[PDB]
RNA sequence: AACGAGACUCUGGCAUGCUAACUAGUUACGCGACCCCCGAGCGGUCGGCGUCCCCCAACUUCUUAGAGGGACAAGUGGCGUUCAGCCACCCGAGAUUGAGCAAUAACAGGUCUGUGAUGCCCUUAGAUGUCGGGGCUGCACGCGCGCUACACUGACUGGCUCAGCGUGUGCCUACCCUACGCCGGCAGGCGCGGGUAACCCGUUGAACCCCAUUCGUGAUGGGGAUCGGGGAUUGCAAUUAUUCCCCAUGAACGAGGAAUUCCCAGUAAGUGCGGGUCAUAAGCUUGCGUUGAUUAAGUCCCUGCCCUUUGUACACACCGCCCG
């Protein structure tokens, strides 16, 4: 199988999906965003750096190779 | 007919069998009750004082 | 000399040996022994140099123990 | 901070930008086109990069008695993929580094050193030390 | 560093090999806490000595597999340090405890050997030594993480965390756990 | 952000839009990676994106540069056809036109009956390589 | 008792001990200067990393090469004829660092193309002894050694950044290693100047690697085949590409059946470098450092060879010699 095809540009509604979902996950990396949506991987990335805004998500290590993000900073 | 799981501790390392020479003879103090003591065959590297987890707890082998 | 990890191990050894060499001539023996104790205990070789060093490659393989390849016939 | 005090990546990052603001460095009109090394796969993603190399070199010279382009080509030179053959060194371009060396001179950061090789100038030595401080000062983190 | 000799930043004390017998070729540090999963390490000369080696490092070594990855310890150390962090985020705890648990849970208790058996060679159920139990477990988990990671976007550190966590409480989600149960199931028949 | 195109055509080739421009362009015969990378840099594009993105504007701008590279600070050495011969060009052949010139060149030295030509005609090899053991299948 | 093994020799680690060193360095001055302000100070001034000064400074620690010592399984404890030995433990380099040296006797093993070693033979002016030119490099197919690969432990761009064994001209007859300035995108071109070298190239500022980015799991950016055009280098001559570069064209290959090699610690494996070949030409061989595991710690099952006992119609010796 595993054939992966990705939405590589923002679709509004997919912008909403992002901010109204990702606070759901404890773990988020490139892959998560890719599998749970159908994000490019390239446009995963840009969503990560953006998300870290003032964060939906919080950095615990962005080793060159890997970001590793946690859920936002709730109760 | 049956099930249980048995802890046994190595008393004395006997020597090596398997024609390949890869199974080590062992003598086991029966852990839950010392008044038992039996011979079992091993896959791994074993040394005195470490512990086996016996399924069969009768049997008691020899060559092979 | 050496390379990147090689260097790290050397500098750390030099520093601990240093400190102890210093307590041996200027401070008192019990202190230096105390230090050799803590290092030697937890350790990493800090005060003693690891021997291990290259073995020479021998014709018939490009490594030391590695032997080339054979097909028979 | 001596420049030696600041980490290489931040130092170079800060100085390279400072050079960018200054607006007067000078730049083989090319720089759009150039790879920077035959070994190289693609040119530089940051087409802006001319500044970064300059900073890198200035820092590189300040450290050492005197250096010249051949050394830089090799430093920049990475491993080149022979394809069928095993990979080997290939000292990186000589035009870019040279131009970098010539341009730096214009600012006076570096000057011809005795017995060949460019050396940092006291003017440059002062300049690098100054930015080095600014970088150290920025923050902890 | 001076108070207690933590891990990258994790405490050795208070981690307990929850499994008699295994106790002790899993080497935490009944005093041995260090700092980094890298050492000069001479384990090879003796048959036993390997047990001395910190389980963490032992796991890190198994990580660097496959011809290309051989000798890349720095890479493994980096992966291991990340994995512990991911594991910690996932359940608090000591990820090192999590690591130990996965190891305790994965070693096949029982196994099978290919006894000659005359013809239609049958296989003899034999119990498995604790050194083997440890050795085998670390493979299983590493092979598990490595196998999963390869065609997926996810990183070894992540796949390792997933293999380690599922195993720590044997979810059976894990490749390793399924493998161990398979090896053991085989041991029981044969007998 | 936004959307559109998937699937855009430049000069006679269909170019997947999802794909990154530099890479996306490299479908076109004669646009290799070093090419397309330098063409785009010349052509002012935010390098950071997808061929499907961008404007009709930028596209003509890529094409215009692509078929007059010399006239844009692209050096001749970067080019596929230096030194023409028939016109003593320089050139960078593109698109359907590369297949064309390839044909020409082969014909040229087949007319002239030069051994290389002959080799191409029988469908062997023309660089000095041994023909005893390989290229057999 | 001797021969092989061993002892023997060589190489390499433990020696703030030994004797020493401007064709090796270090300390530490005297150190000013360059001199920066980097922080402090308003500044003089203090602490600060390097380069340079070189000196009627000092040293041998790193470096060097000579002599010195250390390992004898030494002590101790289990085991064993309580022996020979085996195992654990301490000091500490721990009993086994790694090679070189090879008997008795053999082989129709290989070599006449290493030999002005060589027999006989063959040839020997219309040569089988030299120049012009080609083959050796001719491609439906099989094989062996290898190389490069199959990607996100990765491919990429900027950036951290350390080495080691070795090498050179001034040559048995034509010629060296090359730092540095300039031009060129590259490839390379061009001008210099040192060096019989521990002086110079070269604190071999290597490469993996480490890292801040990009890519995003698409044979895609993994891979670099084949081909086209073109730039240059070696040579008198490269066409049958010597080679290198630049672009373009952008293959199979997405893990390998039957089989099968090799391997126990700086070892396997990744990774660059130097030497030999050499005018030019490395996918080779031949070492070297760097990064550095998994894994037996044994045994005789298969295989191979030698240990007894035993059988043998074998002895050119099982790749051998028995019935119609």
Swiss-Prot record, chain B:
Q: List the protein's name.
A: Small ribosomal subunit protein eS28
Q: Which UniProt keywords apply?
A: Acetylation, Cytoplasm, Endoplasmic reticulum, Nucleus, Phosphoprotein, Ribonucleoprotein, Ribosomal protein
One of the entry's Gene Ontology molecular-function terms is: structural constituent of ribosome
- Compartments (UniProt record): Cytoplasm, Cytosol; Cytoplasm; Rough endoplasmic reticulum; Nucleus, Nucleolus
GO cellular component terms given for this protein: cytosolic ribosome; cytosolic small ribosomal subunit; nucleolus; rough endoplasmic reticulum; small-subunit processome; synapse
Question: In this chain, where does the modification Phosphoserine occur?
Answer: 37
Name its GO BP terms in alphabetical order. cytoplasmic translation; maturation of SSU-rRNA; ribosomal small subunit assembly
Role according to the record: Component of the small ribosomal subunit. The ribosome is a large ribonucleoprotein complex responsible for the synthesis of proteins in the cell. Part of the small subunit (SSU) processome, first precursor of the small eukaryotic ribosomal subunit. During the assembly of the SSU processome in the nucleolus, many ribosome biogenesis factors, an RNA chaperone and ribosomal proteins associate with the nascent pre-rRNA and work in concert to generate RNA folding, modifications, rearrangements and cleavage as well as targeted degradation of pre-ribosomal RNA by the RNA exosome.
Protein origin, superkingdom: Eukaryota
Quaternary structure, per UniProt, is:
Component of the 40S small ribosomal subunit. Part of the small subunit (SSU) processome, composed of more than 70 proteins and the RNA chaperone small nucleolar RNA (snoRNA) U3.
Q: Give the HAMAP family listed for this entry.
A: Ribosomal_eS28
From Swiss-Prot, chain C:
Q: Give the molecular function GO annotations.
A: RNA binding; structural constituent of ribosome
The places in or outside the cell where this protein is found are: Cytoplasm; Nucleus, Nucleolus
Q: Which organism is it from?
A: Oryctolagus cuniculus (Rabbit)
Q: What's the encoding gene here?
A: RPS16
Q: Does the keyword section mention Membrane?
A: no
Protein name from the UniProt record: Small ribosomal subunit protein uS9
* Alphabetically ordered keywords of this record: Acetylation, Cytoplasm, Nucleus, Phosphoprotein, Ribonucleoprotein, Ribosomal protein
The Gene Ontology biological process terms listed for this entry are: maturation of SSU-rRNA from tricistronic rRNA transcript (SSU-rRNA, 5.8S rRNA, LSU-rRNA); translation
Q: Which family does it belong to?
A: Belongs to the universal ribosomal protein uS9 family.
User: Assembly and interactions?
Assistant: Component of the small ribosomal subunit. Part of the small subunit (SSU) processome, composed of more than 70 proteins and the RNA chaperone small nucleolar RNA (snoRNA) U3.
Main role?
Answer: Component of the small ribosomal subunit. The ribosome is a large ribonucleoprotein complex responsible for the synthesis of proteins in the cell. Part of the small subunit (SSU) processome, first precursor of the small eukaryotic ribosomal subunit. During the assembly of the SSU processome in the nucleolus, many ribosome biogenesis factors, an RNA chaperone and ribosomal proteins associate with the nascent pre-rRNA and work in concert to generate RNA folding, modifications, rearrangements and cleavage as well as targeted degradation of pre-ribosomal RNA by the RNA exosome.
Any one GO CC term of this protein is:
cytosolic small ribosomal subunit
Curated annotation (Swiss-Prot), chain D:
Q: Which residues carry this modification: N6-succinyllysine?
A: 140
Question: Does the entry feature the keyword Ribonucleoprotein, yes or no?
Answer: yes
SMART domains on file: Ribosomal_S19e
Q: Enumerate the GO terms in the molecular function aspect.
A: RNA binding; structural constituent of ribosome
Where does it live in the cell? Cytoplasm; Nucleus, Nucleolus
Q: Which UniProt keywords are listed?
A: Acetylation, Cytoplasm, Host-virus interaction, Methylation, Nucleus, Ribonucleoprotein, Ribosomal protein
Major place of localization?
cytoplasm
According to the UniProt record, list the residues that bear Omega-N-methylarginine.
64
User: Quaternary state and partners of this protein?
Assistant: Component of the small ribosomal subunit. Part of the small subunit (SSU) processome, composed of more than 70 proteins and the RNA chaperone small nucleolar RNA (snoRNA) U3. Interacts with RPS19BP1; the interaction is direct and mediates the integration of RPS19 in state post-A1. Interacts with RPS19BP1.
Question: Is Phosphoprotein among this UniProt entry's keywords?
Answer: no
Q: What does this protein do?
A: Component of the small ribosomal subunit. The ribosome is a large ribonucleoprotein complex responsible for the synthesis of proteins in the cell. Required for pre-rRNA processing and maturation of 40S ribosomal subunits. Part of the small subunit (SSU) processome, first precursor of the small eukaryotic ribosomal subunit.
N6-acetyllysine found at: 20, 108, 112
Q: Which Gene3D superfamilies match?
A: Winged helix-like DNA-binding domain superfamily/Winged helix DNA-binding domain (1.10.10.10)
Q: Which InterPro entries match?
A: Ribosomal_eS19, Ribosomal_eS19_CS, WH-like_DNA-bd_sf, WH_DNA-bd_sf
Annotated GO biological processes are: ribosomal small subunit assembly; translation
Q: Which family does it belong to?
A: Belongs to the eukaryotic ribosomal protein eS19 family.
Q: What is the name listed in the Swiss-Prot or TrEMBL entry for this protein?
A: Small ribosomal subunit protein eS19
In terms of superkingdom, the source organism counts as: Eukaryota
An example GO CC term for this entry is: nucleolus
Swiss-Prot record, chain E:
Q: Does the keyword Phosphoprotein apply?
A: yes
What main location does UniProt list?
A: cytoplasm
Here the cross-link named Glycyl lysine isopeptide (Lys-Gly) (interchain with G-Cter in SUMO2) sits at 34
Q: Where in the cell is it found?
A: Cytoplasm; Nucleus, Nucleolus
Q: Which residues carry this modification: Phosphothreonine?
A: 1
Give the N6-acetyllysine positions (modified residues): 34
Keywords assigned by UniProt? Acetylation, Cytoplasm, Isopeptide bond, Nucleus, Phosphoprotein, Ribonucleoprotein, Ribosomal protein, Ubl conjugation
GO aspect biological process, one term:
translation
SUPFAM superfamilies recorded: Ribosomal protein S7 (SSF47973)
> What family is this protein classified in?
Belongs to the universal ribosomal protein uS7 family.
Q: Cite the NCBIfam families for this sequence.
A: PRK04027.1, uS7_euk_arch
Q: Which organism is it from?
A: Oryctolagus cuniculus (Rabbit)
Q: What GO CC annotations are associated with the protein? A: cytosolic ribosome; nucleolus; small ribosomal subunit
Asked whether the keyword Cytoplasm is assigned, the reply is yes
Give the superkingdom in one word.
Answer: Eukaryota
One short Pfam name that applies is Ribosomal_S7
**Where are residues bearing Phosphoserine located in the sequence?**
129
Question: What the protein does?
Answer: Component of the small ribosomal subunit. The ribosome is a large ribonucleoprotein complex responsible for the synthesis of proteins in the cell. Part of the small subunit (SSU) processome, first precursor of the small eukaryotic ribosomal subunit. During the assembly of the SSU processome in the nucleolus, many ribosome biogenesis factors, an RNA chaperone and ribosomal proteins associate with the nascent pre-rRNA and work in concert to generate RNA folding, modifications, rearrangements and cleavage as well as targeted degradation of pre-ribosomal RNA by the RNA exosome.
Q: Name one GO molecular function term.
A: structural constituent of ribosome
Q: What is this protein called?
A: Small ribosomal subunit protein uS7
Q: Gene symbol?
A: RPS5
């Amino acid at each position: 199988r595993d054939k992966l095809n990705n939405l590589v540009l923002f679709d509004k509604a997919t912008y909403d999906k992002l901010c109204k979902e990702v606070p759901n996950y404890k773990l988020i990396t490139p892959a998560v965003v890719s599998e749970r949506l159908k994000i490019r991987g390239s446009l995963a990335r840009a969503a990560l750096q953006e998300l870290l805004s003032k964060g939906l998500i919080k950095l615990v290590s962005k080793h060159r190779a890997q970001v590793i993000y946690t859920r936002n900073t709730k109760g | 007919r049956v099930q249980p799981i048995k802890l046994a501790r190595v008393t004395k390392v006997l020597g090596r069998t398997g024609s390949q020479g890869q199974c080590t003879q062992v003598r086991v103090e029966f852990m839950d009750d010392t008044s038992r003591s039996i011979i079992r065959n091993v896959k791994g590297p074993v040394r005195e004082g470490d512990v086996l987890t016996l399924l069969e707890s009768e049997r008691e082998a020899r060559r092979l | 000399g050496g390379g990147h990890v090689a260097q790290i191990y050397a500098i750390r050894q030099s520093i601990s040996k240093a400190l102890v060499a210093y307590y041996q001539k200027y401070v008192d023996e019990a202190s230096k022994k105390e230090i050799k104790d803590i290092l030697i205990q937890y350790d990493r070789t800090l005060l003693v140099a690891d021997p291990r060093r290259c073995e020479s490659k021998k014709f018939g393989g490009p490594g030391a123990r590695a032997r080339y390849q054979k097909s028979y016939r | 901070v001596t420049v030696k005090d600041v980490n290489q990546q931040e130092f170079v990052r800060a100085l390279a930008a400072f050079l960018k603001k200054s607006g007067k460095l000078k730049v083989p009109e090319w720089v759009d086109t150039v790879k920077l090394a035959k070994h190289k796969e693609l040119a530089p993603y940051d087409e802006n990069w001319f500044y970064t190399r300059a900073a890198s070199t200035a820092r590189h010279l300040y450290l050492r008695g005197g250096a010249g382009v051949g050394s830089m080509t090799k430093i920049y030179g990475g491993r080149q993929r022979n394809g069928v053959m095993p990979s080997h060194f290939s000292r990186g371009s000589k035009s870019v580094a040279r131009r970098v060396l010539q341009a730096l001179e214009g600012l006076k950061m570096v000057e011809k050193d005795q017995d060949w090789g460019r050396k940092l100038t006291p003017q440059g030595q002062r300049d690098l030390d100054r930015i080095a401080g600014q970088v150290a000062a920025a923050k902890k983190k | 560093t001076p108070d207690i000799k933590l891990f990258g930043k994790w405490s050795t004390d208070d981690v307990q090999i929850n499994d008699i017998s295994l106790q002790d070729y899993i080497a935490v540090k009944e005093k041995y806490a260090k700092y980094l999963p890298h050492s000069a390490g001479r384990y090879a000369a003796k048959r036993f000595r390997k047990a001395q080696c910190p389980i963490v490092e032992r796991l890190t070594n198994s990580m660097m597999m496959h011809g290309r990855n051989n000798g890349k310890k720095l890479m493994t150390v980096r992966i291991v340090k990340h994995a512990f962090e991911i594991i910690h985020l996932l359940t608090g705890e000591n990820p090192l405890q999590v690591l130990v648990n996965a190891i305790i849970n994965s070693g096949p208790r029982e196994d099978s050997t290919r006894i000659g058996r005359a013809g239609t060679v049958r296989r003899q159920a034999v119990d498995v030594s604790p050194l083997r139990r440890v050795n085998q477990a670390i493979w299983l988990l590493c092979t598990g993480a490595r196998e999963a990671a390869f065609r997926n976007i996810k990183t070894i550190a992540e796949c390792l965390a997933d293999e380690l966590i599922n195993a720590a409480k044997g979810s059976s989600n894990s490749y390793a756990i399924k493998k161990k149960d398979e090896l053991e199931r085989v041991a029981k028949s044969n007998r | 952000p936004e959307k559109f195109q998937h699937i855009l055509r430049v000069l006679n080739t269909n170019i997947d839009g999802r794909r990154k421009i530099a890479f996306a362009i490299t479908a076109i015969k004669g646009v290799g990676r070093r090419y397309a990378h330098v063409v785009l840099r010349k052509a002012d594009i935010d390098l950071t994106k997808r061929a499907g993105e961008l404007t009709e504007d930028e596209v003509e701008r890529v094409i215009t540069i692509m078929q007059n590279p010399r006239q844009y600070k692209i050096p001749d050495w970067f080019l596929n056809r230096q030194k023409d011969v028939k016109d003593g060009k320089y050139s960078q052949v593109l698109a359907n036109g590369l297949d064309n010139k390839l044909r020409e060149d082969l014909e040229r030295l087949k007319k002239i009956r030069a051994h290389r030509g002959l080799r191409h005609f029988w469908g062997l090899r023309v660089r000095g390589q041994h023909t005893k053991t390989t290229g057999r299948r």
